Amino acid sequence: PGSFKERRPFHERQKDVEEIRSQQPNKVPVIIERFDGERSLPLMDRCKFLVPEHITVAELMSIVRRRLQLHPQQAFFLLVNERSMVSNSMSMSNLYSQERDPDGFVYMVYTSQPAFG
């Protein structure tokens, strides 16, 4: 739609990752976007993140929660390649090889909707 992958073509995305990797070791490049059609969570101004590699999916959710200023009791899920991870205790490092896109980013989307609502 107006998603990052639509705003920037594949080779441009791959070059961007290549450049940042040459500059910033031990950080994982992550695209974080609001799930299409989500209406109860805010937008972030940025979607391109550099995340220190030891941070887990659950910890990243805490970081994004803070930035969105969500109420602590608000439903919030961060999906990796649009689906739930088996464990949110995986570090950015350890899921990178598994979940990264060929362009070098890991793509995540956030939503307020649980798997079965």
């Binding site: 940042i20 972030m44 940025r46 391109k48 993140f49 550099l50 941070i55």
Partner: peptide
Amino acid sequence: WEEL
């Protein structure tokens, strides 16, 4: 880039 948004650097955490």
